[PDB]
Structures are given as C-alpha cells and as structure tokens.
C-alpha cells in the first residue's frame, strides 16, 4: 500500500530482423520447389504506447519488480508483479481493470488488448527489459507444454529477476504473450509460458441515475 | 485474490562451514601475535521453523514467486513477493501482521523476529532456495551502500527469479536480513540490500468488551 509502484518508459514494441537468437535449438521453415530450388521462408491523450519498467521505491532507491506494455491506453503486465496494486504514472493513479490469476495476467485502464496468437513451430522474440540494462530483442523457438484448457507455448530462456512482463512478439511485431510465468523442469531448466488472454470487447449497454 | 499463494517447506536455517564462496572478493580477519604467529580468525502447535517456497498456482502448475522463513511462529518474507496476500499453509489462511514497504519486508502471524545484525567486514551466507533446485548455502562478502536512515550491507550475487526472501545468516546461524531487494549499478552489477528490521516487542496492555 501507499502508491509504492511507478512506471517508467523503456522501449517500443517491434520485431528486430537480426536480433540475437538464443536457445538449444532453432525452428526454420524451408520451402522446396519442383524446379530444384530450396529457400529459407496528432498527440493522443493516452499514455505513450510501449514497454515500461515497474518500480518499487524503498530505501535503496527504485527497484524494478517487473515490466509491462501500454497498448491502446491499457497497461498489461503480470499478476504476480503487481497483484492489482495501483500504479503511478505522471502523478496519475492507474487502477487495475481485469486480472487472470490462472494465466498470471493483469490489465489496467481497460480489457486485454493483445491480438497476437503464437503459431506452433514459429520463432518469437522476447523484448527483455532487464533491470539496469538496455532493452534487448532475443529470438527463440518455443516448445509447447500440455495444460488443462489447451496447449501453451513455452520458452526456455533465463533473464534477470524483474524482467517478468517483457512482451513476446511475432514477425509482424504483434504481441503473442508476456514472458515470466514459469516452472522449472526436473533437469533444472526454467520454462516460461507464453502468457496470453483473448482481446476484450464491448458488452451490452447499461444506463443509470447517479448525477 | 483467491488464496492463490501457498507455502512449502524446503530447508532449515544454518551456517555451513565449507559452503561455496562466491563474489569478486573475500574479507578475511587475520590475527597477528607478538610471538610471530599469524592465524586466520515436544511437538509445538506452531508452523515448523525453516525456509519455505512461496507458490502461485496457475495453468502451468505451481510457480515459485519467492521464499520466506518461519521463526517463532512468524513467517517473514519480502513485501514485493506477496504485497500482503493471504498465504495458505496446511489449509490455514495466514494473514499479514506487519509490513515495511521501505525495507521491502513483511511478516505474518506476529512482528519481525530476526535478531541478527550484520557487522561490516564479516562474510555472510545466503541460503538461496532457487525454484526447482535444492537449497544451497553461498558465502559472500557484503559491501555497504549509503542510504538515508543509516548504512546498509549490500550483496553482489545473482540468483534465479523467485529466490527473493532467501535468508542471510551469520557464523552463528542467526538471520541478519533477507536477500532480494536490490538495484543495478551502472556497470551492470546487481546488488541486493541485506534487508532487516528490528525485532518486535510487547506494547502496553489493552482491555475490552466484545464477547
Ligand atoms: Cl473492451
Ligand atoms: Cl511482539
């Protein structure tokens, strides 16, 4: 309590054609042809879109507890990072609007906005915003993990504590999930879910009398 | 919300005479003498004392979001790990009792119990309980960082995300602080505070009429 969390912009969301690859392995789509060719295949009154550090003020200064993304006026991060705490941005209180403890996700100022859906076999990029480091794109080939309610992509990459909430993007620069909700395998490997919810939409119209 | 956090015992608190040392450097107290010698110097109804993983249940199973310590019936962890969330242990709800956002600390079921105070120049051990790994003692020589309200010990050691709340102990096996509230230096080095509060004590006696 005590509006102890604040936000600070760090980067914009995009795919980087050349970013470092990391992982024990690579998934590469090859196209083979008959001909014998083989080929490798206005200022808006809204928070600036992008990636932000989430910062908790104590005695040592501001420590980064996680990362989130503004997209269409809505701030998206992980449930475990904020547990619904108000977030200060430009002296304004941001209140939580929607949360999924199961998927480990939370949005502030509206419903989930991300539309990306990861396609098995494709490589993705995590835009890792580690405490005290410049943003960095990391290309990786996710596996899948088998859950109730469907199958989920799963990334085997280790980042510093505080990196949870960094977005995962596909080749069009669309966000397919957030990184940082994971488990550790018996062989000692950390794997993060590609955490993603359906984009929200308008319900039926209400009315009222409270002026 | 939804008692999504639970605890699981992982280890007991002790100094390990031989544990691995880690860090760019070592602080070693030498005693020199006149003689020319030089020398290197009942079951209780209370949660079992020790170190516990803090686990959040989602779709991938139980992910470790932090670590804390039971001592004298009180559970001690970091504020950023739970932000005051109820904790489930053996089907019982544990409610938070005291918290310090500035020191990044929280206790459940009573006031802070730890009595250890780190002494400049001494080496300490972090009992690192990393997600999916066995507990491990790590000996390190803390530096100091200069803050308001006094000087704080500061440890330059990197552990996996989820390790915050692991206790730091002195040579007598007394807890001098918890690891995992830190900042990152311009050279890219992570340093954690030795986070510690004064042990609590009984106040003046009240009375009442609410039977
Ligand atoms: Cl909507
Ligand atoms: Cl007390």
Curated annotation (Swiss-Prot), chains A, B:
Active site residues per record: 80 (charge relay system), 104 (charge relay system), 164 (charge relay system)
Positions of the Peptidase S7 domain: 42-207
Lipid bilayer topology: Peripheral membrane protein
Subcellular location: Host endoplasmic reticulum membrane
Post-translational modification: Acetylated by host KAT5. Acetylation modulates NS3 RNA-binding and unwinding activities and plays an important positive role for viral replication.
Function: Displays three enzymatic activities: serine protease, NTPase and RNA helicase. NS3 serine protease, in association with NS2B, performs its autocleavage and cleaves the polyprotein at dibasic sites in the cytoplasm: C-prM, NS2A-NS2B, NS2B-NS3, NS3-NS4A, NS4A-2K and NS4B-NS5. NS3 RNA helicase binds RNA and unwinds dsRNA in the 3' to 5' direction.
Subunit annotation: Forms a heterodimer with NS2B. Interacts with NS4B. Interacts with unphosphorylated RNA-directed RNA polymerase NS5; this interaction stimulates RNA-directed RNA polymerase NS5 guanylyltransferase activity. Interacts with host SHFL.
Protein name: Serine protease NS3
Organism the protein comes from: Dengue virus type 1 (strain Nauru/West Pac/1974) (DENV-1)
Portion of the full sequence shown: 1478 to 1657 of 3392
């Amino acid at each position: 309590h005590m509006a102890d969390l604040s936000l600070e912009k760090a980067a914009e969301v995009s795919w980087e054609e050349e970013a470092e690859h990391s992982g024990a392995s690579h998934n590469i789509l090859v196209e083979v042809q008959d001909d014998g060719t083989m080929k490798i295949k206005v200022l808006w009154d809204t928070p600036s879109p992008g990636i932000y550090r989430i910062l908790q003020r104590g005695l040592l200064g501001r420590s980064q507890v996680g990362v989130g993304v503004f997209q269409e006026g809505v701030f998206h991060t992980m449930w475990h990072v904020t547990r619904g705490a108000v977030l200060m941005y430009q002296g304004k209180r941001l209140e939580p609007s929607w949360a999924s403890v199961k998927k480990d996700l939370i949005s502030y100022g509206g419903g989930w906005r991300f539309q990306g859906s990861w396609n098995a076999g494709e490589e993705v990029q995590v835009i890792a915003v580690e405490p005290g480091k410049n943003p960095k794109n990391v290309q990786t080939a996710p596996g899948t993990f088998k859950t109730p309610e469907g199958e989920v992509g799963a990334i085997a990459l280790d980042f510093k504590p505080g990196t949870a909430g960094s977005p995962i993007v596909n080749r069009e620069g669309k966000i397919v999930g957030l990184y940082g909700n994971g488990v550790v395998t018996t062989s000692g490997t950390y794997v993060s879910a590609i955490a993603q919810a359906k984009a929200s939409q308008e319900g039926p119209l209400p009315e009222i009398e409270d002026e």
